């Protein structure tokens, strides 16, 4: 028995009308979500966004939804994201390398779908999956 569930990683970034005291030109938000009609909270323990050096306390953790980070900045960067599962057996997380990229002349609305595949999950984990929109194959 194999269950597949869907994740959407994405971000929006708009160019500020006025930069901040520190010369931050953009506001952005990055997120992890289920597709429409999918609360991934049921099988997602927490999400960890490993921001760049320059943000204070850059290991950002969301234990409940929304799994998001809102900040201001001046540049884009590569960002590891780790989704940890409400699973007591392996696998207990998955990592994506996310590219938080900015539009210097306007906005960015970016979306990227990732399909997770869990093999022979435990009985109570297979719920969390199916409760979150999972599909059996």
């Amino acid at each position: 028995c194999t269950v597949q569930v869907r994740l959407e990683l994405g971000h929006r970034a708009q160019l500020r009308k006025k930069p901040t005291t520190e010369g931050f030109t953009h506001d952005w938000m990055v997120f992890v979500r289920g597709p429409e009609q999918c609360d991934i909270q049921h099988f997602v323990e927490k999400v960890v966004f490993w921001l760049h050096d320059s943000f204070p306390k850059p290991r950002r953790v969301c234990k409940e939804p929304p799994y998001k980070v809102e900040e201001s900045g001046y540049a884009g960067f590569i960002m590891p994201i780790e989704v940890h599962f409400k699973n007591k057996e392996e696998p207990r997380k998955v990592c994506f390398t996310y590219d938080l990229f900015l539009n210097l002349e306007g906005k960015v609305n970016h979306l990227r779908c990732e399909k997770l595949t869990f093999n022979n999950p435990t009985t109570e984990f297979r719920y969390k999956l199916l409760r979150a929109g999972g599909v059996m194959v």
Binding site: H52, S54, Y74, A75, G76, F77, F101, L102, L104
Partner: peptide, 4 residues
């Protein structure tokens, strides 16, 4: 700076 764009991209750090």
């Amino acid at each position: 700076a764009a991209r750090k």
